[PDB]
Design a binder for this molecule. Sequence first.
Ligand SMILES: [Ca+2]
Ligand SMILES: [Ca+2]
Ligand SMILES: [Ca+2]
Ligand SMILES: [Ca+2]
Ligand SMILES: [Zn+2]
Ligand SMILES: [Zn+2]
Lengths: 339, 339
Amino acid sequence: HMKALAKLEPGLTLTRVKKPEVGHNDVLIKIRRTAICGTDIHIWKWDDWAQKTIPVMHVGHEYVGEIVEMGQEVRGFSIGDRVSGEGHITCGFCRNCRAGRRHLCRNTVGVGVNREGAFAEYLAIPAFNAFKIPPEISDDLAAIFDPFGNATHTALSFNLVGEDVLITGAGPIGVMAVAIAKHVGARNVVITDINDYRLDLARRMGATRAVNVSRESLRDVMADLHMTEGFDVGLEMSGVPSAFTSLLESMNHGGKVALLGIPPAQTAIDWNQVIFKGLEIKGIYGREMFETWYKMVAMLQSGLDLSPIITHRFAVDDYEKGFAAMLSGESGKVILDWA
Amino acid sequence: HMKALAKLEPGLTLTRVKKPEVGHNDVLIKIRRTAICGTDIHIWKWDDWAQKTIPVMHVGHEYVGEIVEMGQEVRGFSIGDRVSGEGHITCGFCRNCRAGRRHLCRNTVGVGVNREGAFAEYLAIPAFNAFKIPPEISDDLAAIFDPFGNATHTALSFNLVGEDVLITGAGPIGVMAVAIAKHVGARNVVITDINDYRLDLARRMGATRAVNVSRESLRDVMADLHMTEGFDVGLEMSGVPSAFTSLLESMNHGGKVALLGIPPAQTAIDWNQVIFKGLEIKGIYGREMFETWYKMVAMLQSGLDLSPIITHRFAVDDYEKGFAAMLSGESGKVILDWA
Ligand SMILES: [Ca+2]
Ligand SMILES: [Ca+2]
Ligand SMILES: [Ca+2]
Ligand SMILES: [Ca+2]
Ligand SMILES: [Zn+2]
Ligand SMILES: [Zn+2]
């Protein structure tokens, strides 16, 4: 049996459950660190989709661990390799899985959502959903590779060299996009939100301005920076309609927009912004490919500093405090330690 | 004095007006052919914007003619050169005009809208808004260079080689985009509308299928062509919300969308189509640059056949019949002759 954080009955209980089975193509991962994700607080809340999807089962899916066992068909891994992995495990043999487009596999299950999650001592997943972490990258950073991949997918969508970048949303992914943008040559990087704590973190991660748009005018900020013509690149991270609206209004002619945050169903936009300015809008799908993760590793190996994004660390026994910190909204990523 | 087609009092009267003045940087064009544009029928109707903007003045802006006079500062033109030209004349000396982005000039006037138009024996415009037509291109084709430029701007936005292309809207610009798409290597080219006449013209210009979506199911058509995965490229020409909705639903993963038609203000779209499929959406601004027109000439010189797009020709005295044909909706482009 193994210790785990489960939805036994809101909240999560520190339960105890049997270890997972290892198929012919599975790796067995002994978990070292797990981050608390935005999906996780929905489960903790026993909220909308939480009451509709969780089997009731331990949750979680942002993790790093060391391989302790593998099936007899697993290729390319040693016992002892440190790995992180994706949030959704796929079939691995369909045409789409075989070509790396596992976001297209017709049989995806969510780790910690549809099946056993990473909030347990041991995690079994298919080898093709695992990603080896090199020893120069810490466990805490490895544990957030999945949201880092979304930030990278969004922020590297366009060339940023000497470009002015607007980011709407200072959640963890938006804050990582700030640091990426400066790393890859952006000029002005302006991020907006309504949370002073999250924006202060963004400033510490290199934002030119971190603008609380309920306290300060984005237009004023642009005039302060001598860029009244508008931004070259906009990364929409929040999914909030007013943020999207303000981002489109703030783009210059020929501006490029990456859409990561998911708008509500009846979101109307001013398509005159898109057409008259010739904007390019690119949807950033949720489940990035491992080619993104290889660029992630390379950036970390080049001195990209993501460390400020980790604001709280707790032992797994003290998981209650980690969800509290996440809930306040005054946190970056929160790490649970399983040592 | 010169003969002209004016809004003297709905409809347009064959009036008689003084010739235009020639500034230092103007060319004076003796008009040969003029096409009836979608803006023109709005003026003929005395409709929404027509009652709000026309000075009451001769209208029109799709033209070809021969230069008969020029100002003393005009460069690069001979008396006798055949020219077409853009729908909006600009200042020509601002930073944006000097770099060819006259769609960005802060002082643009609409030919036949804000100022004297092309429905007259003589037309004066700034030399930098004129474009020389080579002798191997007929006058009738030259007269439609402006909508042809919009079709080219839209259809060449993406690489089409071996790609399946969906075009929504079989107006003249959509029909020209069909012929362009096949010329530049597209595989399946499917166009939709609700007008059987316009679709039949599209079929004659090379459409794989021309689908009346009130009589026939686009989904059925795609299953007939073994492309259930969806289209690679979608060109939205109509501005109709249901057409836009159906186009987004019909794109495959990684699909590319060019947005030429202008949606109504409160158009909501399903952004899940954009994000989950990773679609790329590009706004096609109304006033394309002359780099587009040079590609247009090159395609015509390579055997692109636009001739079927001209469905009616009338003398200028018989202009009443030309507006009648345009109004029925059973026409391609309609040419008025001024010889
Ligand atoms: Ca991810
Ligand atoms: Ca710039
Ligand atoms: Ca045009
Ligand atoms: Ca295809
Ligand atoms: Zn699969
Ligand atoms: Zn200008």
